[PDB]
Design a protein around this nucleic acid. Sequence first.
DNA 1: TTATAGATCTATAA
DNA 2: TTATAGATCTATAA
Lengths: 203, 203
Amino acid sequence: MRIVEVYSHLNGLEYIQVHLPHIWEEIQEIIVSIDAEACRTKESKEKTKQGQILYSPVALNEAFKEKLEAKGWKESRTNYYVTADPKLIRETLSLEPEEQKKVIEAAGKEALKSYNQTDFVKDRVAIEVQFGKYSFVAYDLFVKHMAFYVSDKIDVGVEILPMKELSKEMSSGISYYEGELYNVIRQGRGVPAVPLVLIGIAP
Amino acid sequence: MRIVEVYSHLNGLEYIQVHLPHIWEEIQEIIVSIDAEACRTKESKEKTKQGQILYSPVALNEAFKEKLEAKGWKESRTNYYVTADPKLIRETLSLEPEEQKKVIEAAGKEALKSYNQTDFVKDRVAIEVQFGKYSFVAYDLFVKHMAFYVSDKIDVGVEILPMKELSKEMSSGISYYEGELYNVIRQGRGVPAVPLVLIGIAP
DNA sequence: TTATAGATCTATAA
DNA sequence: TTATAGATCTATAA
């Protein structure tokens, strides 16, 4: 595939270039190596795209996983408990999972187990190949990368999205670089307050 | 239905109380009037909830629409064009739609027509009944309410979500108040920088 | 024809 | 059994 567009939020790319120049190579190489055409297997079933052959997010994901894991990118998961009272949540943010549930219940409140996953993380960098309903991009950007960033676990979040010419050939509901780029640019240029690298591949 | 939980971000509620006290009444009344049990019509088809009767987001939405429109809440839509180059986007943020496309193409760039909808807006208040893929809540919060807020069109965003006891009876993928509340609380208490009122109904 | 939104199924892991 | 994620269809409007 080919890196058609690349945007650097709050110097997210320049950070990689200066401290992990090899990672930048790695990421680019990995992208260029995937044969998107080999991933064109999904037969749309929507009434509007009847009998059409689109690129498969499932295939494209398998392609990225295999390649990325092979390079050392491992998954990271954060478990936590949430409750209805905001002040209780604030008092449990620094504690450990088991410990949070404890302080919550120790107040007659209910403790709900949740978590956040990210299949690719390395040297404090988080990669998100995002081919799902477009709302996940804002979720990835304002919730996840930001979560890791403030938690001092990541130093820059990377979000890979398909350009409009690629999403134009995947099932409905999927986001496209151009648009998401807007969602970030639209609101000044310090929001979200997390270094990022939006990459918009698209062969 | 019943307002089980209510969170006020950056004094979003106190703003309504002091300038549109009647709106607060209105919103509460509207919520209390809807018969959720009458909206229990969707027969799940998932392999895990086989032959179970859940509450319908479709019904619950129709209930909210009818009631809210009846009270004067109208829809608002913002059209705009996006392009791949970030600097071009920055130069077109203040212009009018037709005008944006013009400046974009007048540089050999492609202009992609997009937009943002919000079914309920009144007296500079935006309501979002959100019963869709959980990622839409972060999208509603960090992208839409924020968009209106910075654009000086809204003064406080309102987000209505179902508590865990309600989402526990709707199809998979739907968010629940408790959790989303966390996503906001998790990152300090000035992020996002837009006054909000998260309401977690749940009968 | 198409864009954003909303509706719902399934995949994996704990 | 269940939670978060990811996969995809459809509804409405311009």
